[PDB]
């Protein structure tokens, strides 16, 4: 078991919001349990749009098969951390540009994300908060690039809407290891992520109790 504390900030159409969260991840069992909270009074965009980014921002906890243990890249660069740049193009609802830094500081993992939102318009799903609290499992395809000496991930994420509309957003990610150690970049693989959400009625504050199960293949 490994504890994790992730603090991130994001600016969307002039609205600034910071979110801090804590939890634990079992790599052997391939499980992650997180709980977030926004210090600001209200968060502009729907929570899932950022919850998915926070979930996919860390893949070290994700369990890997025995044959893929040596193939993994995020664990190899874990001792010295890494920096990730993600472009998330929503379908007709603008685009997100995020820069993240992941590092095992002291004896605990730390994850710092900075998010920019652009091309947002009123009456959209993002602006109208029409997205519900449910989520969906997904698949992410990762492939190595020697020219960038890194790993590039790509996939499509389906976000649900109250009226039944489903928005397909394209996620692209590029990694760069902060350290100078061996890369051990995998040629190509796919990771399946299963996410569930729950809320704790003890506190009126929204909890976003988040559970992930990630498996590579």
């Amino acid at each position, epitope marked *: 078991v490994v504890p994790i504390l992730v603090e991130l900030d994001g600016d969307v159409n002039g609205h600034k919001f910071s979110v801090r969260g804590e939890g634990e991840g079992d790599a052997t069992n391939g499980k992650l349990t997180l709980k977030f909270i926004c210090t600001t009074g209200k968060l502009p965009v729907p929570w899932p749009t950022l919850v998915t980014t926070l979930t996919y921002g860390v893949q070290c906890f994700s369990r890997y098969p025995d044959h893929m243990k040596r193939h993994d890249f995020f664990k190899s660069a874990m001792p010295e951390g890494y920096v990730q740049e993600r472009t998330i193009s929503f379908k007709d609802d603008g685009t997100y540009k995020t820069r993240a830094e992941v590092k095992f500081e002291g004896d605990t993992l730390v994850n710092r994300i900075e998010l920019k939102g652009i091309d947002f318009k009123e009456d959209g799903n993002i602006l109208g908060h029409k997205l519900e609290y449910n989520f969906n499992s997904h698949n992410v395809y990762i492939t190595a690039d020697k020219q960038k000496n890194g790993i590039k991930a790509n996939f499509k994420i389906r976000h649900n809407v109250e009226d039944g509309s*489903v928005q397909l957003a394209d996620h692209y990610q590029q990694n760069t290891p902060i350290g100078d150690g061996p890369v051990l970049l995998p040629d190509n693989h796919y990771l399946s992520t299963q996410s569930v959400l729950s809320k704790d009625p003890n506190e009126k504050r929204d909890h976003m109790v988040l559970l992930e199960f990630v498996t590579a293949a």
Partner: nanobody
Amino acid sequence: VQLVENGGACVKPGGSLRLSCAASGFPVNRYSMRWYRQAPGKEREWVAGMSSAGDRSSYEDSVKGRFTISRDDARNTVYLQMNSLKPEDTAVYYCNVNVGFEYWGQGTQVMV
């Protein structure tokens, strides 16, 4: 919780067939139902959805006004009507509903 699909068979151009998706383990009326369509060797694409409250349904531009899906809570089943048949319907269908952790139905295959 399990989802079962039935009513799928090949249709001649212009024909109308009815698909049915039923659930066992959870109340269908409490949560929203969705329908996906994917072709051989093609990415899955959302083809239809009905809101949890059932006030309105969401469809894409290609097929807006054809599926005309309906839902029965007493019957615990959602019915889909082909109406006009187009080549895009050649792709196979899937019935999806996510209560807690997501659940994917077995679906049925239909081709023109």
